């Protein structure tokens, strides 16, 4: 659910 920059 943390897939990087957003």
């Amino acid at each position: 659910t943390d897939h990087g920059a957003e």
Partner: antibody, heavy 122, light 108 residues
Framework: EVNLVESGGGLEQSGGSLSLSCAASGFTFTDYYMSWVRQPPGKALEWLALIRNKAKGYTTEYSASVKGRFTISRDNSQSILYLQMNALRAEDSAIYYC?????????????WGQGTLVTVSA | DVQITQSPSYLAASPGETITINCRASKSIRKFLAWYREKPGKTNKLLIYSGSTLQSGTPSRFSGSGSGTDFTLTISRLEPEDFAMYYCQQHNDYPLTFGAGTKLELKR
């Protein structure tokens, strides 16, 4: 059936302004992050700008490399992404691509257009 | 900004063979590296994201791994459509930045 179609590229002189369009189809436009990335003839890919989805209030991010000269915006009813390019210079000559994220990693580019060629020259 | 160094810049291979590309970031990007394929006439294709996750439509013969600064892409059992240009891209922080590319050409 996702398609992204850039237009608006062509020849301009240094000093003026140009606006590019990207017509999006085949997906729910408002659900996705949209970006512009450019690639000059001989060079590297260069990310320029991103605009977030409705859930994030359509906020933006920009590469400081272009010194604020470009503005990204979206027409949500028409599913069109825009890049306004001010104070054009020869070094802006490149193919300009629009791109959409993959639905998970919001800063990746799952779908791209074929691009539009911008030429800044005398 | 995160500078990414992609190597080698050029590879030659044949169908059925395997190649590897490395990408090294100037500072940690956690696990957040993506890979793309570029080919004249086609739109760019996202292969892998978050270092090792396959994007839908990417065959299992693509393998990625790494964390922090050092990452790798390996394409095994190469097929004709794999002979193309490859780029890595960090997606940990803004500005989003790319490797300079690797040209995978067909041996003859």
């Amino acid at each position: 059936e996702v398609n992204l179609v850039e237009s608006g590229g062509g020849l301009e002189q240094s000093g003026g302004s140009l606006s590019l369009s990207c017509a999006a189809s085949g997906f729910t436009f408002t659900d996705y992050y949209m970006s512009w990335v450019r690639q000059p003839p001989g060079k590297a890919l260069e990310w320029l700008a991103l605009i977030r989805n409705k859930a994030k209030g359509y906020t933006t991010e920009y590469s400081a490399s272009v010194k604020g000269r470009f503005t990204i915006s979206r027409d949500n009813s028409q599913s069109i992404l825009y890049l306004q390019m001010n104070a054009l210079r020869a070094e802006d000559s490149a193919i300009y691509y629009c791109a959409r994220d993959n639905g998970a990693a919001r800063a990746t580019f799952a779908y791209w257009g074929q691009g539009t060629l911008v030429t800044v020259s005398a | 900004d995160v500078q990414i160094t992609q190597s080698p810049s050029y590879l030659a291979a044949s169908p059925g063979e395997t190649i590897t590309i490395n990408c090294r970031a100037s500072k940690s990007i956690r696990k957040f590296l993506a890979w793309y394929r570029e080919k004249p006439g086609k739109t760019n294709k996202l292969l892998i994201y978050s270092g090792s996750t396959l994007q839908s439509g990417t065959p299992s013969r693509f393998s990625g791994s790494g964390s922090g600064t050092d990452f790798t892409l390996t394409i095994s059992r190469l097929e004709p459509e794999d002979f193309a240009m490859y780029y890595c891209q960090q997606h940990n922080d803004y500005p989003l930045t790319f490797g300079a590319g690797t040209k995978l050409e067909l041996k003859r």
